[PDB]
Each structure stands twice: as C-alpha cells, then as structure tokens.
Design a protein around this nucleic acid. Sequence first.
RNA 1: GCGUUGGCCAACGCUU
RNA 2: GCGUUGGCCAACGCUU
Length: 234
Amino acid sequence: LYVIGMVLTTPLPDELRKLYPPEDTTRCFGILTAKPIPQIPVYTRSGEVTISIELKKSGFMLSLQMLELITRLHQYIFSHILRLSAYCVLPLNVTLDIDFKFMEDIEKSTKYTKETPFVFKLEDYQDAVIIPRYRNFDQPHRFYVADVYTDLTPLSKFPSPEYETFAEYYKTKYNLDLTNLNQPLLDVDHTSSRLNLLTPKQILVPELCAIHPIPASLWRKAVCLPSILYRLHC
RNA sequence: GCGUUGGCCAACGCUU
RNA sequence: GCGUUGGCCAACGCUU
C-alpha cells in the first residue's frame, strides 16, 4: 500500500468560481503492492496541486476476497468515473489503511407522490455529484453541485422566455411532475474534464436528480489520476 | 455552462 | 500559411 497524497501548493489567484483543495478531505487514492517502488504536480481547476507518493504499509498480504474487491473497485474507477502505471488504485481514509466500507458502499450498486412526497436533506447535496435521472438516454451526465440556491424553488422564473417556471420546463419537455415545490435549486458544473492536466442557466432540481456514490471532492481528486499516472508509469 | 463552425488577438511548436 | 492551447465576438445545436 502506497498513498497518492495531494496538497495544493499554489492556489488560483484573485484574477478570475471559488476553490476546492484536495487536503480539506481525508479520503484519497492509493496504490496496492506486488509492485516495485517508483521515484518521486498536476494543474487543476482549483489551481496548482503538488503530488506525493509515499509508502504506508510494505509487505502486507491481503485476502483474495479483499483483493477481488479492490480490483473490482479499480476497474470501477477507470471505466465508470473517468471514461477511457501500477496495480489497483484504491480509496484511503483514516490516509490510514484502506476503506473497505467505502468500497463496499460504492459496490451496493423512485416513487414520489402527494401521498408519498419528496424529502430534501441539505447535507446530501453538499458534497455531491448528481445525475439528471430524466435523460440518461445517452451516456448519463455527472455534475458537481456548484451552488445551492435557497432563494429559489421549482416555481421560479425559468431563464428562458419559452417557459415561465422550472416545474413547467420539466413538465413540457420531459413530462415530469414534482412532489416538492419548496425544494431549493442546484447550480451545477460539469464533471467531464481535460485528460492531460500536466500543463496550465445550469440549474437543476434535486428531486429530478440522483446522487452519485463518489463524493464531489474525491471526484475532483480522481480527475487527477490519469495525469498523475502518465509520468509515474513514465 | 457545454458543443460546433466561423472570424477577430495571445503564446510557444512547425514552416518559410 | 499551418498547428496548438488560450481568452475576447458571430451563428445555429444541446442544456437550463
């Protein structure tokens, strides 16, 4: 077990959206053994982020069960989180050990009525990547919750004239009925990003959106994974 | 916000 | 002249 550790040395200056530092969260990516030890920054949306590989536990033997789990999750990172070195990349937490609960949680793989309403918990949208459930018809889309607009509801004026309200937008286009008209809205930014990081409207309805098991922060961390691995392998 | 073609500037690379 | 990233406008397409 090695840890792919992350800190932003040089954050983005006041010139031009906020900031999202990888060290504000403890959960990260790491690399399993059976491999020889390599030698010892990627430039993100959150600014310049320096990267450090360290050894954590050498000479550990892990169960074939847990090995299957870590490899399954490895492929889940690369086929599912991104779309396209070393053995399995894995989640680490309290940097301490391996997170088996996290992996098992991910591996766990919607009726709203007036009699059966939709409940809005704010926490669920705080660190979140979401999907419109309404249009997975081609290659489901994933968005970080950029903002939560608490002064807004689905009955708010739609940004385009052809529609007066959001509820009306989703009703006319997607034939979508909302059981919560009091829910706040979510500004979102797209998760699909650049592959080589080595060199330097959009409002959604919580009720129409599924939440992704990979927290937005860790997503943002994962987007580094290829650019890291490019010169690690090389 | 994204995409796409389309000009109008920046910057290093080719090219001359 | 080309290429490449990078902003700054045009236009239809997605999206909201």
